[PDB]
Amino acid sequence: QKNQAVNFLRMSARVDAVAARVQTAVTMGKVTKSMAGVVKSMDATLKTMNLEK
Amino acid sequence: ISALMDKFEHQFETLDVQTQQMEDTMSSTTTLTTPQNQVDMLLQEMADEAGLD
């Protein structure tokens, strides 16, 4: 029982780590998409709003 | 009947050898998780102080 406790708990560690980096990957994804969004909408609204007018 | 009974002895005898075999491979597969040394020191640990509480 005790050595199993060690083994499992170790798996918990490493799997948790990958879980963290995947988390970062997803949130990074959201930020990227949304940012693309603002760059575009702002761009097509920068074409008819171009500074001279 | 008597025949059925010696047949009985032989039968569950084979049960016991099946048991023994099974538990040999079954206990030699997971055996990394139960060292002999560790168990020795444990059993000793609870030997010397066994009834002292």
Phi and psi based region of residue B35 (left: phi greater than 0; alpha: psi -120 to 50; beta: remaining) = beta
Distance from the B34 Cα atom to the nearest Cα atom in chain A, whole angstroms:
7
CB-CB neighbours of B6 under 10 Å = 9
Distance from the A14 Cα atom to the nearest Cα atom in chain B, whole angstroms:
20
- Resolution in Å equals 4.0
Residue B33 near residue A4 (C-beta atoms within 8 A): yes
Residues with Cβ < 8 Å from A3, sequence gap 6 or more? Answer: B33, B34, B35, B38
The enclosing H or E element of B3 equals helix B2-29
Residue B34 near residue A3 (C-beta atoms within 8 A): yes
Residues with Cβ < 8 Å from A44, sequence gap 6 or more? Answer: none
Residue B33 near residue A3 (C-beta atoms within 8 A): yes
Alpha carbon of residue A30 to chain centroid: 6
Cα gap A50→B27, rounded to integer Å: 78
